[PDB]
Symmetry: C3
Amino acid sequence: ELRREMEELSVSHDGVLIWKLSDYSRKLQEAKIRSNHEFFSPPFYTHRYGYKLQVSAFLNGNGSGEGSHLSVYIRVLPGEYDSLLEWPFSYKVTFSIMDQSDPSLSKPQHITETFNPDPNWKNFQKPSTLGFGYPKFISHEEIKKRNYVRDNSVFIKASIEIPQ
Amino acid sequence: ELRREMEELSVSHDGVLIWKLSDYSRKLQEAKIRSNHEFFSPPFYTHRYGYKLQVSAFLNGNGSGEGSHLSVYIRVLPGEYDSLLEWPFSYKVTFSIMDQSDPSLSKPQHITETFNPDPNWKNFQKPSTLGFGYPKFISHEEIKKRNYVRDNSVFIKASIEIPQ
Amino acid sequence: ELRREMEELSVSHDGVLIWKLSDYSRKLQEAKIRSNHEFFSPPFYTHRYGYKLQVSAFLNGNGSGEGSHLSVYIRVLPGEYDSLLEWPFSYKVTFSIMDQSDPSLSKPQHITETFNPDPNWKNFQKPSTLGFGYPKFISHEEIKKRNYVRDNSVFIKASIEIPQ
């Protein structure tokens, strides 16, 4: 299956995944209709034979962010190499929404959060489903400022700290 | 035909290929019927524009391992960049069958062999195929111990030492 | 689109792209009929979420190389991450045509040029399309010497200097 081996060559470079959401305005409008409308990133591996992770977003917010914020979560997926890895998952995760301006002409102001995975979080235990994240990661009023939206797309970056 | 350029994106990370054989028990029973039943790994490159190598296994053994051992071999394949490389192939190769237990929760005991390629080995000369390996790499009695089989799959790792 | 996501997994290793042109003699003969016959490399990214570049060649030459030289150019393509990058593009580019002989049995003599991108070059500005290069990169008389052609193929290498 060429789709299935498509997914196995999805690996983060130095632990970094950048998820591009294009056609933001059309996707936001759909999210504002659907009460729990969640977009999912392509699966990515932390390192080559490591953990399979996936990022998701609620363009019109989840929980306390509903109607006011973009909510961002990450979750562990069942991976082909899980029985070789340490459990529970515990690498520190950092979320960013990118300020899309030229780093030479200004200093971009990315919005960033970082957490250390909770050892009791069910999803961070060895897969055999609720992801961890930020319901109020960035508000609709803030994402309209600077260049968090540009050419009608947004960039979510997830970066995992690998001890190497 | 996207499969062939799927193959050109198969590269080892730092010289390392991990080959997952799933559904071990059904594959073993087929191997116990067919006298020389050989499974082949996906091709992988040593480094980015390097040598194309391939691992193979006889789940019910080859030669002196027939009926008692898993036999593991590696071979050089014709690669798209061969005329740029040094010949014969000579990087040291290390085979492992992985003990699939949690490295924090225990200390996995992987079984490992390593060889230095023989310069007279016909397959290690420049291609336009007998692979080199171990007929008695691990016995049927040993693979049933610890976690060399887990969730009905086994992991063969091939590691190539790149001088860089 | 599996062809479109084929392209997003095309990245240079340490900034390096090697473009193999096989069936050189048939392609050259076509080039000698078509006055401005240009072959294009697969797109490649400088680094993981970096600039999308593309190499091209005129097997029977372009401009002052027409009829006598292989001409080589590079150009910036619209990339999925452009608004995250510095503009104009400015990493130094190095072109090579590889002498395809064994580096242990001989010392290969690759032909090499290198330039620093001109800040006023229209193609090196942020895309919303003329590439920069060498019309007389290597002459038909020189490419017939040593092993610049071997097994009826040639290797063009482009290497980008990434500051990291």
